[PDB]
């Protein structure tokens, strides 16, 4: 059994909270796609159940064990909680906080303002999501953990409604690096030094957060519209940056452009990002800006 170190503390599979299999009930599927299915479940405490295929390799097993260790060792309101694991029965389970709002990317697309739902979303809703994730990122930063794939698809919402809280919900990329190919790398979320020299720092996540911010204020569009991975790589390496999302307030766009500074030392840390998001939320001209209504 591999050890895991976070914040200078070491943990082992023995530290994982094993939940007796008899206490766990599956309710419905939520998704598969990526390696492993996820179900809604009960332990009555409601959970999302990530499963390990019984038909897997030794490495798949170690990967699964490692993400369990990673998530269980985090303690922050904007990172999905791990209720525990069930590793002593097959298929093996990781039990997560059930985020009823689902993933952020799908939410943004599904919840875009429409003629039928003219006020489904406001600038403040987006700013609050951005703040929430930036808070999670600041926690990772101050604990020297580099996420490596901050993107809408990896964020979850506690509920569809106005009191929703956003959290980082997937750590698969970080898990892989802790221990794939070019075409699977999240190049559209990566800074120049990352995909060139394979250098990662906390400023990597700052760049990625900029792209997430664009995803949020575009209401769930794929970054760099119409560009392939290699076109983005060449575009960004040459100094190219995304335009503002439709109707995006200037102060918000400016946060994006600061996250995308070529030199990592010129990019803000998350304390500063949160400061700037806060300032945006106070500014009437920002939050009174109407989001586009999709016909
Ligand atoms: C299919 N998506 C994932 O597996 C997925 C994608 C990104 C991510 F960060 C975490 C997950 C899975 C591991 O965890 C969760 N998914 C949902 C959930 C996700 C999608 C739709 N409805 C849901 O709950 C009602 C809710 N809570 C979770 N703890």
UniProtKB/Swiss-Prot annotation:
Result when mutating residue 178 to S: In NBLST3; somatic mutation
Post-translational modification, as annotated: Phosphorylated at tyrosine residues by autocatalysis, which activates kinase activity. In cells not stimulated by a ligand, receptor protein tyrosine phosphatase beta and zeta complex (PTPRB/PTPRZ1) dephosphorylates ALK at the sites in ALK that are undergoing autophosphorylation through autoactivation. N-glycosylated.
Tissues/organs with expression: Expressed in brain and CNS. Also expressed in the small intestine and testis, but not in normal lymphoid cells.
Residues the record lists as Phosphotyrosine modifications: 4, 39, 178
Consequence of changing residue 66 to R: In NBLST3; somatic mutation
UniProt effect for mutating residue 74 to V: In NBLST3; somatic mutation; constitutively activated; retained in the endoplasmic reticulum and Golgi compartments
Compartments reported by the entry: Cell membrane
Domain Protein kinase: 24-286
Superkingdom field: Eukaryota
Residues that coordinate or bind ATP: 32, 50, 97-99, 170
Active site residues of this protein: 149
Function statement: Neuronal receptor tyrosine kinase that is essentially and transiently expressed in specific regions of the central and peripheral nervous systems and plays an important role in the genesis and differentiation of the nervous system. Also acts as a key thinness protein involved in the resistance to weight gain: in hypothalamic neurons, controls energy expenditure acting as a negative regulator of white adipose tissue lipolysis and sympathetic tone to fine-tune energy homeostasis.
Subunit structure and binding partners: Homodimer; homodimerizes following heparin- and ligand-binding. Interacts with CBL, IRS1, PIK3R1 and PLCG1. Interacts with FRS2 and SHC1. Interacts with PTN and MDK.
Disease: A chromosomal aberration involving ALK is found in a form of non-Hodgkin lymphoma. Translocation t(2;5)(p23;q35) with NPM1. The resulting chimeric NPM1-ALK protein homodimerize and the kinase becomes constitutively activated. The constitutively active fusion proteins are responsible for 5-10% of non-Hodgkin lymphomas. A chromosomal aberration involving ALK is associated with inflammatory myofibroblastic tumors (IMTs). Translocation t(2;11)(p23;p15) with CARS; translocation t(2;4)(p23;q21) with SEC31A.
Domain-related comment: The EGF-like region drives the cytokine specificity for ALKAL2. The heparin-binding region binds heparin glycosaminoglycan. Heparin-binding is required for ALKAL2-driven activation.
Family to which this protein belongs: Belongs to the protein kinase superfamily. Tyr protein kinase family. Insulin receptor subfamily.
Protein name per UniProt: ALK tyrosine kinase receptor
Organism the protein comes from: Homo sapiens (Human)
Full-length numbering of the shown residues: 1093 to 1401 of 1620
